[model samples]
Target: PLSPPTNLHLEANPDTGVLTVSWERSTTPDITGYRITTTPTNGQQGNSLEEVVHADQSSCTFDNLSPGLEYNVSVYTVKDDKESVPISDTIIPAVPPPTDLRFTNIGPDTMRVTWAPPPSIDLTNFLVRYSPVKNEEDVAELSISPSDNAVVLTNLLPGTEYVVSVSSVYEQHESTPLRGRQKTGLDSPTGIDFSDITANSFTVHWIAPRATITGYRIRHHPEHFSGRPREDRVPHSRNSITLTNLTPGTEYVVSIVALNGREESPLLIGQQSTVSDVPRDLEVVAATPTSLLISWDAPAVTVRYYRITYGETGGNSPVQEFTVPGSKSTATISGLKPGVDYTITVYAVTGRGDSPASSKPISINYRT
Candidate 1:
């Protein structure tokens, strides 16, 4: 019996990490079936991708390919006498993925990441996904990976932690993911980071990661820390948590993790002056021609005054600062461009560097 005529073609995507093999069917009447053979480009000839029975099937799909790797592919046809012949030969490849990621600065709203040698996989490219907190899933993805990784994603709201993960592609095959994490670094009280906070409820802030904290514990103390201070232990996880059923203006003694993982931090006993009975009533009230008039009732008890700052549109440059007497509820920012939509923010100035900035970010657009 004469050998059947067949042809094979191969293509690869490094981004998706998948290799695809296609072949033309045999024309010879005696050809009964077809098979696929594949091997790592570096493998020996005999060991090169083995022939897998796939006569009726027109194509073969290979997955889990490494970036920048090479592969060998071939197709074979079977005859009525149970004989076969190699009909086609081809090579596929996956381009290298990007590597080494770094962040210029990590903060509540902005996290700039720049990587070395952006990926250039012709097949599939890398994808960038980020979230503020692990619990919260506000994921955002940018598709500039097959080429670049230097990104400056803007409009990142506030009070959220961010997690970043990267994955490579080659058609259908995807390489193991590379991941990195960073919080939208917060400006809570010095050394204080709140975790497991209740919905719509805020916790007392504390400072510094302690070697002692296996994870800081939180407690619910009455608005008043007077008396013998019989403060009931509030539930705590990670760095912070808020007690529900809180009366407005109610004060709390948000604590910190004196220990880390289990090793207590130097300051095991973390405490804030005193939180309020009610939560921080931070909100945007009104704006003026060249100024924004912002106000918030104190957090129950009177702490220090607030620090008010202003900048041109987009909250950049021409930054001006003012200190509200630590006893004031509002500040009238001056010297802003009218109609330019200046951004104004307020910070609660306590020894800890302002209670997480009056609930993170209290921004107002002064549309003069």
Candidate 2:
């Protein structure tokens, strides 16, 4: 088996779809020449392997590579029609496409974003290319190298449509971008402008001019907007998504910035109130010697704490409280006093206050 090349470097130009492969001078003495070889990321065979332009050439350009496949590059040292151990080891280039493109909230001036990382390359940075859906030169190129996935483009005007796209970069080369577009919020304010409000968390939406509007930005503060504890603004194409894991019953203000060309639309602010989960439908079906079977509608969330209280009309905090964690829609409560009449009530627990005791309550009689 031939050894692989040593000290290989892969560079790419995403816009041109070109990958350059180069290696350091080989240490093997009396080397006649060098051999360069390439295999697609997916193992699909192609045209004959390209021969080096010059025997002393330690580098060559690879053309027409796929968007998200990993590629293996190798270089061999040749001597007297024979090859020495392939230099050192094979090299894999990092060239991946951007991911998780979507829109957040739409406002009169701006929008928002939420997204994930791209596929296949070691991302040294990200490039967000945005422009007016109608005007191409009116584009905005946001370079966020040495940054994270979420980016907010603020300072946009109201009622304008913009196209946006994201791409990853590695060294000299860049990757293809995930693109989309969105319009700013309406001028005339309607109902409650949830734009700057979150009880603790909130849900946002936007109307897209074209399917091209696929990413958004969500910015929030934990307590009052002191500008600390801000979450990474995410980019997504979904119309709405809930921002959670905030301070319970706390007030939070947010802003959504939609990127259009090299310009960031003005800020569109909103708010939210973080509140406890509400429990519903407390139906007590069957009861036995000292237990009862109760059911209800599950909340949108899966993980929650359930507190079911029961006792005589004037018992302290009800006779006893059943504490259930990581709860579901139904729970079986046992360890009750036999032949006792008990009224049961339930509440969904969240960081904030509990839901007003479920409207429906169950009366149970434990049989002897």
Compared with the true structure, all predictions reach lDDT values of 0.55, 0.60
| lDDT per residue (tens digit) for residues 1-368 in model 1 | 44543666777764535678777776656456666666666664323445455456677776654455555666667764565566655464544455677877654467887765433345366667777665655788876656655777566653345677666665675554556666453323245544433323455555533112234444445556555643333223444445455433334454433323333222334433333323255555666665556787665444455766777767556777777766778766655566576666666554454333243335555556
Score candidate 1 by lDDT: 0.55
TM-score of each: 0.30, 0.31
Candidate 1: where are CA atoms >4 Å away?
1-20, 42-47, 52-55, 60-68, 80-89, 92-182, 189-368
CA error at residue 160 for candidate 2, angstroms: 1.8
| Residue 17 miss distance in model 2 (angstroms) | 15
lDDT of 2 by residue, 1-368 (tens): 23334787777665325678787766655566777666654566532244453446778787665544455666677765677565433334445666678888776556776567654335678888877777879877887854577667676766567888887776666766778888765343112244332334566554433222235555677554555555444453544556665654566676665544433444556666665345556677776777788776644443356677777554456367876674566778787767566677776654435542332233443333
